[PDB]
Design a protein around this ligand. Sequence first.
Ligand SMILES: NCCCNCCCCCC(O)(O)C(F)(F)F
Ligand SMILES: NCCCNCCCCCC(O)(O)C(F)(F)F
Ligand SMILES: [K+]
Ligand SMILES: [K+]
Ligand SMILES: [K+]
Ligand SMILES: [K+]
Ligand SMILES: [Mg+2]
Ligand SMILES: [Mg+2]
Ligand SMILES: [Mg+2]
Ligand SMILES: [Mg+2]
Ligand SMILES: [Zn+2]
Ligand SMILES: [Zn+2]
Lengths: 344, 347
Amino acid sequence: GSMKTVFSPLHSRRHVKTELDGGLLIEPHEKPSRAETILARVKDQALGEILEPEEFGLGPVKRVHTADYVSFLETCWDEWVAAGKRGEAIPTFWVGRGMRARLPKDIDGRLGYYSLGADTSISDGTWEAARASANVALTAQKLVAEGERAAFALCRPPGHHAHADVFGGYCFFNNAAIAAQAFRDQGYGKVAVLDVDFHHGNGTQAIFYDRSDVLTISLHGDPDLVFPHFLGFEDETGEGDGEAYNLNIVFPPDTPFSIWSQGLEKACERIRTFAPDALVVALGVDTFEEDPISFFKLTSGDYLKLGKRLEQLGLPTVFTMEGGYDVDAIGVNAVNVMQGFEGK
Amino acid sequence: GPLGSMKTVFSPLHSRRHVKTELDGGLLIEPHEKPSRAETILARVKDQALGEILEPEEFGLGPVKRVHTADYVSFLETCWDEWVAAGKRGEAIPTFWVGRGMRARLPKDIDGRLGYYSLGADTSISDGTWEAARASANVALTAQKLVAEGERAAFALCRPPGHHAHADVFGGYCFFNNAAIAAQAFRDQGYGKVAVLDVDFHHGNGTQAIFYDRSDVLTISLHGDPDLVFPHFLGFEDETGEGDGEAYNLNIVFPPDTPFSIWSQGLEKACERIRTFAPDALVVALGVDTFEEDPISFFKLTSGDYLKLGKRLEQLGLPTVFTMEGGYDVDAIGVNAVNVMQGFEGK
Ligand SMILES: NCCCNCCCCCC(O)(O)C(F)(F)F
Ligand SMILES: NCCCNCCCCCC(O)(O)C(F)(F)F
Ligand SMILES: [K+]
Ligand SMILES: [K+]
Ligand SMILES: [K+]
Ligand SMILES: [K+]
Ligand SMILES: [Mg+2]
Ligand SMILES: [Mg+2]
Ligand SMILES: [Mg+2]
Ligand SMILES: [Mg+2]
Ligand SMILES: [Zn+2]
Ligand SMILES: [Zn+2]
């Protein structure tokens, strides 16, 4: 069975040089070779047709992200350079506990207001790559809505950590949330977003937190121990009409696929009772045993089983690429999910 | 000239805080809040024979914990050790924090705790930060005791500074809110009410937050517009307190190129608010980064204006503790800070 992949070469326009890590500025983990290695394996395995995204404009993006946030991402680098800063655009101050969530005028204050971390430098081309990556997800969703059983959105930058008006965790536009909202806007009554990336999809959770029409599930490492730290706990089950439409399943270091799979089954069962009309899978392969910044122990073969189990949900499915940082295996791992899904 | 009567408290342990990196404009550069700041001010204290100089008494963490939460104090004692133990190779700097929409929930990992307890990433923690912050609170508390025991005023030559630290948040180069700690010590010793006046260029956000719902401590700050400058998310003029504290916080905000003539009009307003409040003691959070030559200032105070500031503060007629806050160590840093004390003493 074949599956189409949407890939944009514009991802390379985001090529930052610094990442704040352990008190030093290091080479960034979320680097362009990630997207190129997955794309190469897609070709090598003849998974299916590869296409460039169509341009949907900011309309579908602003169905999820606030107008102010979108404007800020467009002008942030220019404002940063104009203000005389010499590094890449990195937050120095933020709304600390006890302060007001009030938007200030200065670039440093806006940059903290709209962020949850300092590891996600902004520079020239970030706006364009974030736009292109959102259009990648939207093209995959159009492919599925127009007849494809599934499509692979090879997004870079990733998306699942981005709130309606907060960037961080290498994410700017929540590609999965945008594709989910695209389904809803096109008449799909109910959408599930399943987050199998190693880290919590905190952005997706926040975006739909008070809603029952989009079910949000994430499996991830314990946020007591890893990013995002301040969301992702198992007591976060929604609010208002969204109560019982968010589900976090956390795991500790050294978790093997046998145990992680038990969490997947719980997720799948919650999807079954929810009975959605479409599925968005925010796919990260940083659950891999050789991932440099994560502590699960999945093997490359386990990604074939993952894709097989997702296919058994029987839903229209859009895969949005999130994390995964072992550059030798990232291509093999991600395409294995797709090949698993296609019965291979 | 003869030795004056304004005593200065100074701890050599301030040099235990001596960090190598500061995040600024996307670069890790040499920090702006250097040990030479306190040494150069101290040299002017000696050179002007302002008064006796003494080392602080050790008061212990008790008076610190009248202002700061126990969890936060424990965090600052262990932060460096936890950071090294987790394998980080740089100084201890927040990478993630409680962004809008996330929970104010304390996590286990050192990275999460660093972010939970911080409002900024320009304030690296390293070895000796705990000890220097402790010594600096003791500097303020020794100054408070000197005034409680009979002195009209004393100068707490604190480093690191304190006015940006909340009960459980550090940032803006500050760890323990020395001014607040001294204000609470006045209160704990039977002074019915205390006013804390912040003349540093930046908003005293920590002090405001600490007493924000209280009427027994009046908090006033003059500062550059937080729309433009740190701390950005507090310090606006509509923050007037809450609950019992309503009308007991006053922020006085100024734009770029503000001259002493206009800054003094806000100082007159602050002094009037202190007069009708009628406190039993006054704590002045003194920054000299209002100086026209301070690299982060956009006020136009001259060195002579600091003499006029000190004279005006004396006219309040209050028992007064000065805690040293900000001010870059351009050549005149000590001239300017000590000018405040000499003007208070009648120069
Ligand atoms: N310098 C310190 C950064 C350490 N790592 C932060 C964890 C972010 C996880 C990102 C991800 O993998 O979930 C995404 F897909 F969004 F990129
Ligand atoms: N790399 C970014 C830091 C730029 N600096 C602005 C905020 C520092 C204000 C501190 C102060 O002057 O109020 C204190 F008294 F605490 F020292
Ligand atoms: K996840
Ligand atoms: K939901
Ligand atoms: K001030
Ligand atoms: K107050
Ligand atoms: Mg600024
Ligand atoms: Mg390897
Ligand atoms: Mg950590
Ligand atoms: Mg009275
Ligand atoms: Zn991840
Ligand atoms: Zn200052």
